Design a protein around this ligand. Structure first.
Ligand code: MG
Ligand code: MG
Lengths: 122, 95, 88, 242, 46, 68
RNA sequence: AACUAAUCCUAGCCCUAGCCCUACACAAAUAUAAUUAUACUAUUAUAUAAAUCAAAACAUUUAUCCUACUAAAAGUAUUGGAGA
C-alpha cells in the first residue's frame, strides 16, 4: 500500500533515516560527537562599493542595440597578444621559448584561480 | 582421449556450407579410449654416462615415463632429432 | 571560455569521460573531487562501469524498438503531404 | 521492418568502423580468419568417396566435428586440444532403451616444464596428449612456436608465444647474461621462427586487449590554442618579410 | 480469524526487500530492471 | 502523355565489386568469371589461358580418373 | 407538439519498398534505504534447454522451434518401435 511515485525525503521513514536538502557542509564532526565549524568553509560575499555608479537596472528605448558578435578565442588573441609579437618580430627579438613574456602560462598549478579543472565557483 | 561416434546419420551439407544439427545428433557411442592402447617407446641420444643404459651418443629406446622424468629433465639425454643425430655421429666418427 | 581555450585548450571546465553502464548504454560521466586516489577508495570501487553478456539481448531489443518509431514518423509525413497537395 | 544487413555479418561490420578500423591490418586478419581445429575426439574420414554396402553404390562423405565444451580453467593450462564432451548415450547400447545424459572428462595432471628461450620453469595442468605432442615437436619450445592458435587452445599458451617471439626478435641479451656463447647457440637453433618485432607485439592479444593498447598509443593532452595561433602568425609574418 | 490485513507497513523492510540496491545485487535482479525499462515503466523499483 | 522508354536488359560483361559485403557470393567464383567470356567472347577481358586447368588441378583430375 | 438519446471525420495506425550506424540531450544530483558535495566496507552471466504435443495409450522417435543464396534435380537416394 506504499506510494512508489512520490519523492523519498527525510520527512518520511523512521527517526533513524535522515538526509540533506542540498545545503553544502560548513564543518566537520569529530568523535566525542561534537561539531566543529571551519571558517574557510563558509562562503564569503564579495560586495563592491556602489557609490557614484552611473548604471541602473533599465536602459532607454532610444539607445541603439548593436549587431551580435560573440567573443571567440581568435578575437581575444588578436586584440591582446598579436600587437606585441608583431613589433618584436620586426625587431627580431622573438623566440618560441619566451612565450610566457606575452602572458602564456605553461601549467595552472600554483595559481589561486585555475582554469582547468576549475577550482572556484561563479 | 575419448573418441565418440554418432548413432544417427547427418545429411550432407554441401561444399561451402555447414550441416544443421538436431537434438538426436547429440547421442554418442564410444569407439575407443586411447589410454588403453599398448604403450610405445621413446628414442633418445645420451649426452652423459648413465648406469645400465649407455655412455654417450648411443640411441636408446626407453619407456616414456623414464625418458620424460629422469633423462630429459635432468639433462642426461637429448631428443633423437635428425639434427641431434647428425652432430653426435660426426663426433663419434672423428673420435 | 575563450581564455580557457588559449591557456589549456580544453572545451569543458569539469573533467569527464565516456563510459558504459551496467545496462548497456553509453553515458558521459562527470568526475568528483576526492582526497585520495581511486585505487584506494572502497566506496568508489563498488561502482561498475561494464556490462555482462546477458545485456546483449536487450541492446538489440532497444535498437529495433527505436527503428519502429522512426518508420512510423516518416510514413505519417508522406501521408500528410498527400492531403496538402489535394487541397491546394 | 528489416535490418539492412544479415545478423551474422554484424561482427565484421563493427571491425570495419571506429577505432577498430585504426588497428593494424594483419592483426585484424588474425581475428577474421577461422580455421577448424585438428580432430581430437572423432575419427576423420580417410577418403571422400565410399561404397555404400546395402546398395553397392558410390556415395560422398563429409566430416562433422563433435561440439566440445572448454571450461574457463582450461585457459590457465596447456591441454592438448582436449575438452569436455557433453552428450547422451543409450542404456545397454541398444536404440530401444532409455536415453541418458553423459559427460566424458579428460584426465588432468600437474607437471613442471622448462623453456630454454625464457630460461624459466612453469607448473602447468596438462593432459597426456599434450606431452606426446611435445615429444613429436622435439622440445617444449618447439611445441609452442609451431602450433597454431586453434590447436594450442589456451590463452596462457598464446602469451608464452608472444614472449618467445619478442625475445628472438630483439635478440635480447637478458638470456644467460655473461655467457654470450651459450645465448648465441639458443637463438641460432630457433632462427626459422624470427619475425619483425612490430608484428610480435600483437600476437595472442584479445580484442579488448588490442583496443586498450591502441587507445594508450594515441592518447595525448590537447594543445593550447595560444601556441597554435602563434605559429600561424609567425609563419605568415615571416613570409611577408621575404 | 478475520483476514484481509496482511500488510503491516514498515519502511525499512520495504526498501531492503524491493529497493534499488537490492535489485542490483544479483544478475537476476538486474534483468528485472531491464525488462521494466524496455516496457517503459515510470517506477523501476521501490 | 508519352510512355517512358521500354525496359531493357543491361548489356556487356559484369564484374561485381569484391570488397562490398552485400555482393552475392556466387557472383565472385571462378565459374562466374568463365561465364562472362562464354557470353561475351574477348570483350570480357578474361585471360584465355585461365580457362584450362592449372598444373596442380591437373594432377588431381588424373589421380581421380585412375581410381574410379 | 419531448425527454433520455442519435447523426459526424481525422487523431493516429497496418503491410511493403528503400537505407546500416556515427542521437551519446544546459547547470547540479544519483549505485548510500539511487537521484544525499569527500575516505569507513571491494568488484565478476552461462556446463547439452525442457515439457506440452503426434504416434488415436506409451517407453526409441515427433517438421518449425534449434537460420546460411533463389529455380531445378526431388518428396528421388537415404534414415525410421522400417511406423507416425
Ligand atoms: Mg490487498
Ligand atoms: Mg500420444
Amino acid at each position: 500500500g506504499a506510494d512508489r511515485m512520490s519523492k523519498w525525503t527525510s520527512k518520511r521513514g523512521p527517526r533513524t533515516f535522515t538526509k540533506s536538502r542540498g545545503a553544502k557542509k560548513t564543518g566537520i564532526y569529530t568523535s566525542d560527537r561534537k561539531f566543529v565549524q571551519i571558517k574557510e568553509m563558509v562562503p564569503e560575499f564579495v560586495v563592491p562599493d556602489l557609490t557614484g555608479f552611473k548604471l541602473k537596472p533599465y536602459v532607454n528605448y532610444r539607445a541603439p542595440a548593436g549587431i551580435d558578435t560573440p567573443l571567440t578565442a581568435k578575437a581575444l588573441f588578436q586584440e591582446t597578444v598579436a600587437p606585441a609579437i608583431e613589433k618584436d618580430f620586426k625587431e627580431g627579438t622573438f623566440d618560441a621559448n619566451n612565450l610566457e613574456k606575452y602572458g602564456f602560462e605553461p601549467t595552472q598549478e600554483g595559481k589561486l584561480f585555475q582554469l582547468y579543472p576549475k577550482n572556484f565557483p561563479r | 582421449t575419448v573418441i565418440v561416434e554418432r548413432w544417427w546419420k547427418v545429411p550432407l551439407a554441401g561444399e561451402g556450407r555447414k550441416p544443421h544439427l538436431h537434438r538426436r545428433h547429440r547421442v554418442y557411442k564410444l569407439v575407443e579410449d586411447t589410454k588403453h592402447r599398448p604403450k610405445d617407446n621413446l628414442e633418445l641420444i645420451l649426452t652423459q654416462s648413465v648406469d645400465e643404459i649407455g655412455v654417450r651418443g648411443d640411441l636408446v629406446s626407453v619407456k616414456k615415463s623414464v625418458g620424460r622424468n629422469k633423462l630429459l629433465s635432468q639433462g642426461l639425454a637429448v631428443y633423437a632429432s635428425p639434427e641431434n643425430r647428425k652432430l653426435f655421429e660426426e663426433e663419434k666418427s672423428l673420435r | 571560455d575563450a581564455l580557457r581555450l588559449l591557456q589549456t585548450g580544453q572545451e569543458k571546465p569539469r573533467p569527464g569521460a565516456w563510459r558504459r553502464d551496467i545496462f548497456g548504454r553509453i553515458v558521459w560521466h562527470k568526475f568528483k573531487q576526492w582526497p585520495i586516489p581511486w585505487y584506494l577508495n572502497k566506496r568508489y570501487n563498488r561502482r561498475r562501469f561494464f556490462a555482462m553478456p546477458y545485456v546483449d539481448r536487450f541492446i538489440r531489443l532497444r535498437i529495433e524498438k527505436h527503428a519502429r518509431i522512426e518508420a512510423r514518423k516518416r510514413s505519417l509525413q508522406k501521408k500528410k503531404e498527400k492531403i496538402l497537395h489535394a487541397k491546394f | 521492418p528489416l535490418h539492412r544487413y544479415p545478423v551474422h555479418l554484424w561482427q565484421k561490420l563493427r571491425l570495419r568502423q571506429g577505432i577498430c578500423a585504426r588497428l593494424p591490418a594483419h592483426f585484424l586478419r588474425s581475428l577474421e580468419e577461422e580455421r577448424t581445429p585438428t580432430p581430437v575426439h572423432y575419427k576423420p574420414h580417410g577418403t571422400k568417396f565410399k561404397i555404400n554396402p546395402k546398395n553397392g553404390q558410390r556415395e560422398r562423405v563429409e566430416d562433422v566435428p563433435i561440439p566440445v565444451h572448454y571450461p574457463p580453467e582450461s585457459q590457465q593450462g596447456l591441454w592438448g586440444g582436449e575438452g569436455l564432451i557433453l552428450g547422451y548415450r543409450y542404456a545397454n547400447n541398444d536404440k530401444l532403451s532409455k536415453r541418458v545424459k553423459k559427460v566424458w572428462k579428460p584426465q588432468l595432471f600437474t607437471r613442471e616444464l622448462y623453456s630454454e628461450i625464457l630460461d624459466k620453469k612453469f607448473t602447468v595442468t596438462v593432459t597426456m596428449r599434450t606431452l606426446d605432442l611435445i615429444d613429436e615437436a622435439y622440445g617444449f619450445d618447439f611445441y609452442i612456436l609451431k602450433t597454431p592458435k586453434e590447436d594450442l587452445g589456451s590463452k596462457f599458451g598464446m602469451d608464452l608465444k608472444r614472449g618467445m617471439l619478442l625475445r628472438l626478435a630483439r635478440q635480447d641479451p637478458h638470456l644467460h647474461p655473461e655467457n654470450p656463447e651459450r645465448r648465441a647457440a639458443i637463438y641460432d637453433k630457433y632462427r626459422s621462427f624470427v619475425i619483425p618485432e612490430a608484428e610480435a607485439e600483437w600476437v595472442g592479444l584479445t580484442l579488448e586487449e588490442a583496443l586498450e593498447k591502441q587507445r594508450l598509443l594515441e592518447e595525448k593532452d590537447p594543445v593550447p590554442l595560444f601556441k597554435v595561433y602563434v605559429e600561424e602568425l609567425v609563419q605568415r609574418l615571416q613570409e611577408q618579410v621575404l | 480469524r478475520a483476514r484481509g490485513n496482511e500488510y503491516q507497513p514498515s519502511n525499512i523492510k520495504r526498501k531492503h526487500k524491493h529497493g534499488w540496491v537490492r535489485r542490483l545485487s544479483t544478475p537476476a535482479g538486474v534483468q528485472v530492471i531491464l525488462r521494466r525499462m524496455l516496457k517503459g515503466r515510470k517506477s523501476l523499483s521501490h | 502523355y508519352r510512355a517512358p522508354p521500354p525496359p531493357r536488359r543491361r548489356p556487356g560483361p559484369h564484374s561485381p565489386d569484391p570488397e562490398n559485403l552485400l555482393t552475392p557470393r556466387w557472383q565472385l567464383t571462378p565459374r562466374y568469371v568463365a561465364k562472362q567470356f562464354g557470353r561475351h567472347g574477348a570483350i570480357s577481358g578474361v585471360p584465355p589461358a585461365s580457362l584450362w586447368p592449372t598444373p596442380e588441378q591437373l594432377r588431381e583430375l588424373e589421380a581421380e580418373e585412375q581410381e574410379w
